[PDB]
Amino acid sequence: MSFPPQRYHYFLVLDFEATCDKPQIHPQEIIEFPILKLNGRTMEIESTFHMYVQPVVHPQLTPFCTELTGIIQAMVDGQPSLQQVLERVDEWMAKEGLLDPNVKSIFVTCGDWDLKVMLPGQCQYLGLPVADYFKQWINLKKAYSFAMGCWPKNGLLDMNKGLSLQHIGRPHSGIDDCKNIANIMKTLAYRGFIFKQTSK
Numbered sequence: 716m717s718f719p720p721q722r723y724h725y726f727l728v729l730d731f732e733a734t735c736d737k738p739q740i741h742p743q744e745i746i747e748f749p750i751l752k753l754n755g756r757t758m759e760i761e762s763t764f765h766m767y768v769q770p771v772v773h774p775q776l777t778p779f780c781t782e783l784t785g786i787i788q789a790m791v792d793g794q795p796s797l798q799q800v801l802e803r804v805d806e807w808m809a810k811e812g813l814l815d816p817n818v819k820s821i822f823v824t825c826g827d828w829d830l831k832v833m834l835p836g837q838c839q840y841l842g843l844p845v846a847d848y849f850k851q852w853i854n855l856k857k858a859y860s861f862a863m864g865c866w867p868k869n870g871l872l873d874m875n876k877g878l879s880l881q882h883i884g885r886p887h888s889g890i891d892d893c894k895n896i897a898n899i900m901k902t903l904a905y906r907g908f909i910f911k912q913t914s915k
């Protein structure tokens with residue numbers, strides 16, 4: 716059954732980028748906040764939220780961070796901070812119609828880190844409540860492991876390799892990582908996979 720009925724009207728693909736260094740910076744702060752809204756049945760991209768975020772605790776991006784993500788200082792200077800971006804997300808959700816209880820959506824991330832560690836950790840640091848729609852998600856690696864029967868070693872790169880897909884854009888670009896997640900999801904749906912919440 717190619718592209719079977721799914722349990723959600725929409726999938727929200729998210730992949731943060733955060734301040735970093737070697738050794739790792741502390742604390743890390745979200746600097747890129749992308750969301751791709753996918754049609755629940757076809758996995759086609761229908762809307763995009765994308766904002767760079769101004770870090771505050773460590774406001775200057777390290778050379779490693781800019782080299783890893785491609786995000787330069789001018790992309791985060793003058794941006795809203797996480798608190799305001801989270802308010803922009805809520806407005807975006809409202810306009811998309813995703814705040815209707817009868818519209819079922821779920822976030823999809825590559826790994827658990829984004830919504831199990833990064834966002835709650837920074838929100839706790841800032842004293843900000845985490846919106847309830849951030850508290851359930853699908854770990855694509857776990858989903859892939861049920862669809863393909865195997866554990867990918869290196870995230871999106873190895874999942875594209877397993878599915879014979881060309882990598883979209885630049886690795887460690889948040890928006891480009893989201894497009895790869897969406898492309899992997901589309902192929903898994905073509906193979907007949909029905910996505911399920913994995914977060915506990």
Ligand SMILES: Nc1ccn([C@@H]2O[C@H](COP(=O)(O)O)[C@@H](O)[C@H]2O)c(=O)n1
Nearest residue numbers: 730731732733734735736784887888892
């Ligand atoms: N080698 C790496 C890979 C990721 N990271 C951190 O983890 C974040 C999320 O990783 P991805 O770019 O793989 O999504 C990065 O924005 C960066 O802060 C890192 O600091 N060193």
Ligand SMILES: [Mg+2]
Nearest residue numbers: 730887889892
């Ligand atoms: Mg990323």
